[PDB]
Ligand binder design. Sequence first.
Ligand code: CLA
Ligand code: CLA
Ligand code: CLA
Ligand code: CLA
Ligand code: CLA
Ligand SMILES: CC1=C(/C=C/C(C)=C/C=C/C(C)=C/C=C/C=C(C)/C=C/C=C(C)/C=C/C2=C(C)CCCC2(C)C)C(C)(C)CCC1
Ligand SMILES: CC1=C(/C=C/C(C)=C/C=C/C(C)=C/C=C/C=C(C)/C=C/C=C(C)/C=C/C2=C(C)CCCC2(C)C)C(C)(C)CCC1
Ligand SMILES: CCCCCCCCCCCCO[C@@H]1O[C@H](CO)[C@@H](O[C@H]2O[C@H](CO)[C@@H](O)[C@H](O)[C@H]2O)[C@H](O)[C@H]1O
Ligand code: OEX
Ligand SMILES: [Ca+2]
Ligand SMILES: [Cl-]
Ligand SMILES: [Cl-]
Lengths: 30, 450, 243, 334, 95, 118, 135
Amino acid sequence: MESVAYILVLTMALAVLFFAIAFREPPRIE
Amino acid sequence: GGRDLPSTGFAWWSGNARLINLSGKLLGAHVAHAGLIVFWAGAMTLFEVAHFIPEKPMYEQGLILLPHIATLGWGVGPAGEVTDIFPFFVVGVLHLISSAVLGLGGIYHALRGPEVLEEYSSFFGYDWKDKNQMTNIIGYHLILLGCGALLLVFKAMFFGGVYDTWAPGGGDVRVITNPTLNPAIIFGYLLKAPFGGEGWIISVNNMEDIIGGHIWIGLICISGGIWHILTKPFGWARRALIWSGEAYLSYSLGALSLMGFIASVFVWFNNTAYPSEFYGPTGMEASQSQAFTFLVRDQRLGANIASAQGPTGLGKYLMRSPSGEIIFGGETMRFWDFRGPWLEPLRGPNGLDLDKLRNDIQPWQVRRAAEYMTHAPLGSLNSVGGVITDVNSFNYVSPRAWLATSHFVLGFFFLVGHLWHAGRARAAAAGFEKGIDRETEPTLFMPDLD
Amino acid sequence: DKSQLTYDDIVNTGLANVCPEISSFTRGTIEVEPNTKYFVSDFCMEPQEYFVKEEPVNKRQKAEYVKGKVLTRQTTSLEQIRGSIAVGADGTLTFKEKDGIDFQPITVLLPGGEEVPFFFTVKNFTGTTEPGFTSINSSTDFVGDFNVPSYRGAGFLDPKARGLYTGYDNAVALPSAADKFRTNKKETPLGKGTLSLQVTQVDGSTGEIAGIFESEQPSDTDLGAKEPLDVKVRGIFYGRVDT
Amino acid sequence: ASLWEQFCQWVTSTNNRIYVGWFGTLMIPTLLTATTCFIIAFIAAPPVDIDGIREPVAGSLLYGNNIISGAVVPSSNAIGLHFYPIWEAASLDEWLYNGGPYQLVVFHFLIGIFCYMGRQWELSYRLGMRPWICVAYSAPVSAATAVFLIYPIGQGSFSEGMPLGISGTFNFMIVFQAEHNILMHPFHMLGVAGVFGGSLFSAMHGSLVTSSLVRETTEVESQNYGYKFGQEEETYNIVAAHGYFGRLIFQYASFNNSRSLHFFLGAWPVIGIWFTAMGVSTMAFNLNGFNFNQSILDSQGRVIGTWADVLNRANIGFEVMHERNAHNFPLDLA
Amino acid sequence: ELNAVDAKLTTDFGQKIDLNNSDIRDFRGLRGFYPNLASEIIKNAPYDTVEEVLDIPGLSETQKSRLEANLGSFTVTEPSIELTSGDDRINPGVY
Amino acid sequence: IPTTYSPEKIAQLQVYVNPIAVARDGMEKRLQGLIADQNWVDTQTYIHGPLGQLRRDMLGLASSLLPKDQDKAKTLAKEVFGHLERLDAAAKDRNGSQAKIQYQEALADFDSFLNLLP
Amino acid sequence: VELTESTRTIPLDEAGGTTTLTARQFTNGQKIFVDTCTQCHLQGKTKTNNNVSLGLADLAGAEPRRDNVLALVEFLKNPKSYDGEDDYSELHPNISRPDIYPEMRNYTEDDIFDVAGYTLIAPKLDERWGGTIYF
Ligand code: CLA
Ligand code: CLA
Ligand code: CLA
Ligand code: CLA
Ligand code: CLA
Ligand SMILES: CC1=C(/C=C/C(C)=C/C=C/C(C)=C/C=C/C=C(C)/C=C/C=C(C)/C=C/C2=C(C)CCCC2(C)C)C(C)(C)CCC1
Ligand SMILES: CC1=C(/C=C/C(C)=C/C=C/C(C)=C/C=C/C=C(C)/C=C/C=C(C)/C=C/C2=C(C)CCCC2(C)C)C(C)(C)CCC1
Ligand SMILES: CCCCCCCCCCCCO[C@@H]1O[C@H](CO)[C@@H](O[C@H]2O[C@H](CO)[C@@H](O)[C@H](O)[C@H]2O)[C@H](O)[C@H]1O
Ligand code: OEX
Ligand SMILES: [Ca+2]
Ligand SMILES: [Cl-]
Ligand SMILES: [Cl-]
């Protein structure tokens, strides 16, 4: 059942990668 | 002619970049470097001859030029024995004297000639933007390259032949009388997969194939030379390419990187144009030799080498390749595509034939296998032979190993040069090689990404 | 279907795992004496269909065979086998296997994910016919026994470096529980298989016989770790009986 | 106006959130293919007969591995350098057994990272940049090509390529040392100089810039809010950093030109990783590290050991136990 | 429980050279045996007793005299398949 | 300058002529049947196998011969090697007639080389 | 200690005769061993056949025994099998066949004496002389 835990933690990292690219705070010149 | 950085904008470590628009000095640098190349060829050949024991194998003595001369069929007989020391010395002496001539010429053009050749002659004067003159120089160099390929063909066909490692009776200097002019064979060597069992052009296995390909290469190069001399670049070529000296340098760097990679693979895998009598066995040859040597030894001890199963269930000496051919067992299963003149006598239509292994193995094949197995291209940087766990008593690194390693490193660094010069050529033709203009910084006029 | 094919024509095509066939029908016989020996020159065996006998959780339900797909590539054929055929005083025909490439390790995949490695072999095969035979014809049928040696040799090492004449005799990774495992002791016994070679096509002018075979044998035990499954191999064979 | 020119303008657009470009038109399919096959194989591939001796190695998570031990196992030694796509297998299960996923992932990954380097050049050209970021990226690319392609080519089998896993990488490194003595190879030493010095100089640069930050925040908020994105002015005092560093060592050991400092920061680990990529690529052809074993003898002739001899004892212990069931002959020729 | 060759090493296989199970390398201590006479001994295995090793066909007077000169180095045990399968008596993976 | 076969010279010759005699004997025993049966695979493996040291042995013989019998032996050996090359080419082409003609030419040149020996 | 005379004193024949090499003879025999022997006999093993190694027990077990100078010289003129029955003149490097082994056609008789002397002295300088390939 450890395979579920490994899949969850890898999926959490990949979801963090998606949300950090797609939904970053936009860099604004001001 | 600027020779300082205030007068050129190039620092001393980029100082040959000051030669980009100075044609006569640039010609002098080239001729001087060419002289360096011919100097190394001559002096290294003289060194190799002076450090040559001719009754000893060439691959045992750290020689890389004498194998090249011997492959052309100079000073050698059957099985690569050196009959005459003199042709190697002649090749060395000729390069060394021509290098003296070339160095004098390079130093003249670099230090006393016209700095720019466009104020002296329209034939040697070249502007990098002048597409017709650069294609003329391409055409000249192409004609002479085709002549060099035909000179190799003339040597193999009308001037005593070349070393054929596959010749009946053993390898010998033989005259190629029937080169393959068939375009199917020659150009299907180009369509073969660059992978195991196919090997692209590295798998060229006979001197007839090599010589026919060089006739085709000479014809192609002479035709292309006459082409670039008679035509201007077409609109697709002018619209796709960068037309500048750094660009042409980087194109040549990419080609050189490709050719260095191909030469490293060629000397590592091919034993036809790089015969094992001169360059030593390949890694595949030595592994197959070890398997064959212990097959012969255990067969002499009475072992049934066909029915002997190993610890894993595969045969200890003989097994099947993934397509079913009868091949040597052990880790050498990976080298089952190896072909060599000592092993092809024992190969049947289905692979290694049992009857030939049982009663057709000659003592010279046993000797050759033991020599090749004990001369595997494995060695420390300090030239200690064998596996790296061996102690220090065997002074050997294969010339195949040296040549493949050197030319792979050169090919990589010339790919790096291509990238550096292709990028700089594009940046300089586009005008931003010196940095971003502050007033017209391009990103400042773009929409935000999010 | 090769005959005149060069190794360059055959290489990487998979035809080297194919046994040669008879050129045409040529349905004839080989006339044999009452009490002499003949040599079989290059006996070949191409396995084609593979079945593993199921062990159900019940102990009374019929076991049945299930087809397996071959995880190894075209490395499944025996070839260049020398042997002998002896004709008996009653008339019986005794095919005896001497040597050659007479074993191949083969892994077959079963439905459900069970990979079954086994030692497909014709090693020391002795097979006999019915009595009253005077010619090797389409009714000739050598049924007999062959030796199936252990798939892993006794110098093989398991992933904890335990084997039979080499390796540890205990689980060294667990030092206080090193001798608690039944897989510490390895064993490479000799199993038995049954092979039937039914000759279906004979060539009289060349001494070429061919036909089908059905063989039954155990599978790998991995040096005695698991019970061997029953493997039935169906295929075709070819040979040259020297007259 | 034309449909092709509209497609060319979309492909080469700097307004794409992720730049595509012509190198990206090769990068994205190859990298997505390699990523999908790697994830599926790392979770659920069946065991792979890497040594070609019918001894399949469980590499995936569903077959008993964890994250550390899991790997996409290299293709079979029986395959060697042979091209092994899916359509060259009789079934998908055979392809999985012989290590076809490794070949698929590695080939599409290598094309993808070469196209990543080309795309880095492409975007630098479209943005009006100088073009040599791709040259710096060519050092990890060369190292990856050395361990996934060049070492298999020189050794003659894709089974010799680095496995796509953590413990598989450790296995590759240990077998590399036992066979090639990579620690004694000066190109690996230059690589260690590259990575140790790159981390050193990263720490130096970062610590000096953080040390010489101009006061633009209170003591409450984070000092990073003293920098505004797209500000014209410098966020730190380089002259103060140079005064500190030329008193820490001596005056002429410190950079004052920031451009020379950043060229050095780029060039040091890149040249080190280039050299170690070439070291692995040259030990592909068995040009191994230094062999100083039994180099010191006494006057009688007896061997006096050095640290290289103890290193060789370790190398022998690694070698005699590696691929324990794959060797049938006395020498490990390749 | 001991495996098979450990049980053999408990027997006289571990003290001297067994004509049914011992490898060819074990015959090197006997002068004039390796490789020819040892190969003939391994080829003509099994033997019920030690003395029928002198009954091997093809034995010249020198081979018979060298086998009689060193008959006290030999025993016979039951031929074990763990040491015999796949020609381990010629090459057991030891160099 | 012996001008006759010395008692030590024939003995020194023997080391080279024994592989040459073996090659000649196997040429009139194996190769003829291989060519006659259209066994081109076995023909090529014979001329590259047990004939695989014919060149070295013949040239060592022709050099180790009498001081005035070197050149004729050398050119007959080269003619033998040329005929064997053309026979190899014919066997690769699967040409029976050319292989037969080249085998006969090789046999004639080999017999002349044998007649040159003392 | 030094390279003493007891280190260079080795059996000369089967009858209890001994010879003592010189320092120059030992150096020449070592150099010849590096140049021609080590490609298969590195550290006293034999990579092609480690059943027949250059260890002293291996040399003593040959027929006749090869733990003396004259026996090693005779093996380097006319090599045989380990039991002395077969002919290895076409299979082991030797001085009687310069046609197939030209790397040793420039070795004199004293060079064979020196390399045999080194082959007898080198086992008492290395304890791993004549062991397993990986030892
Ligand atoms: C193959 C190597 C090579 C070659 C052929 C050249 C060639 C050239 N370089 Mg150069 N360069 C090189 C490597 C090379 N370089 C390297 C590695 C660096 C980095 C340090 C430089 C940095 C550099 C700078 C900064 C400049 C050049 C310049 C030049 C050009 C003129 C030199 C000059 O006028 O001053 C003359 C120098 C001397 C008179 C000193 C004496 C040197 C002589 C020539 C030694 C060789 C003689 C030889 C021993 C005799 C053999 C002849 C025969 C009898 C056998 C010239 C064509 C200049 C230029 O761009 O032109 C406008 C310039 O500004 N280079
Ligand atoms: C790639 C090499 C190369 C190139 C393109 C040039 C080009 C030039 N040279 Mg130069 N030179 C070179 C190498 C080269 N040279 C070498 C190696 C030397 C040493 C001998 C010289 C020494 C030299 C001097 C002293 C002078 C020139 C001059 C000139 C200019 C006019 C020459 C002319 O048209 O007269 C007509 C051309 C001919 C009559 C062609 C004759 C055929 C040649 C010379 C012989 C064939 C070469 C060879 C045998 C064939 C193969 C080469 C071999 C290495 C494989 C011209 C721009 C002159 C100059 O400075 O301009 C004002 C000048 O006075 N050169
Ligand atoms: C080294 C000598 C040399 C050099 C420097 C040139 C240089 C040039 N040639 Mg020329 N050519 C040569 C030899 C040479 N050629 C020879 C020997 C022939 C006789 C066959 C020709 C026949 C020829 C023709 C007919 C044309 C040129 C053209 C050109 C110009 C542009 C070509 C281009 O854009 O490239 C790039 C090519 C492409 C973008 C097309 C796609 C090609 C694919 C990508 C190649 C795949 C290779 C693959 C990756 C590697 C695997 C190897 C194998 C399987 C092929 C350029 C200046 C063109 C020109 O401008 O006319 C004057 C033109 O139409 N050449
Ligand atoms: C194709 C290139 C090449 C190859 C394959 C060889 C191969 C060989 N050489 Mg040779 N040599 C070469 C070029 C080459 N050489 C050149 C250009 C010279 C002139 C200097 C020589 C002068 C020479 C001599 C005098 C001798 C040899 C010898 C030998 C043999 C033993 C090598 C050895 O142990 O040295 C040691 C190995 C090294 C010192 C490795 C050096 C690694 C280099 C420096 C890497 C370069 C890094 C990179 C390219 C720098 C730019 C990267 C940058 C972007 C950071 C061997 C067969 C010896 C021999 O046996 O003769 C019979 C001998 O004594 N060579
Ligand atoms: C024949 C191919 C070729 C040619 C004609 C050029 C030409 C040029 N390059 Mg390029 N380049 C090339 C290949 C080539 N390059 C390759 C293969 C690489 C990858 C390494 C590069 C990377 C490169 C960079 C990073 C730069 C250039 C630059 C330049 C320009 C000036 C360079 C100069 O003055 O030399 C000066 C020479 C030196 C300062 C000495 C170099 C010595 C190196 C570092 C070590 C030598 C190693 C060698 C193997 C010997 C080992 C010695 C060891 C034993 C101690 C010039 C037009 C400059 C530029 O872009 O201007 C337009 C520049 O910045 N090139
Ligand atoms: C420009 C320049 C440069 C360059 C230069 C160069 C690159 C050069 C060159 C040059 C050359 C390229 C040269 C040469 C030479 C050669 C010679 C001079 C020779 C010779 C000869 C002889 C004399 C020989 C002899 C002999 C013989 C006959 C044989 C035997 C042995 C002997 C050896 C004795 C530099 C970088 C510095 C920088 C500055 C500028
Ligand atoms: C001698 C010989 C031979 C022959 C060979 C041949 C015949 C060849 C060839 C070849 C060829 C004939 C080639 C080629 C090539 C090509 C290339 C290498 C290319 C390319 C490319 C490019 C460079 C392009 C680029 C681009 C693109 C991609 C698109 C856009 C535009 C541009 C331009 C950017 C043989 C092997 C048989 C045998 C042995 C020897
Ligand atoms: C979403 C994209 C596609 C995902 C990948 C494709 C589906 C593959 C995974 C399906 C999920 C698990 O699917 C199933 O897992 C089990 C459990 O290990 C595997 O089962 C395997 O291992 C188990 C024990 O480890 C054993 O019974 C046996 O060795 C084998 O059957 C099956 O072979 C696989 O079919
Ligand atoms: O696979 Mn992976 O590692 Ca290269 O070396 Mn041989 O083969 Mn296998 O043993 Mn050690
Ligand atoms: Ca040697
Ligand atoms: Cl092996
Ligand atoms: Cl391992």
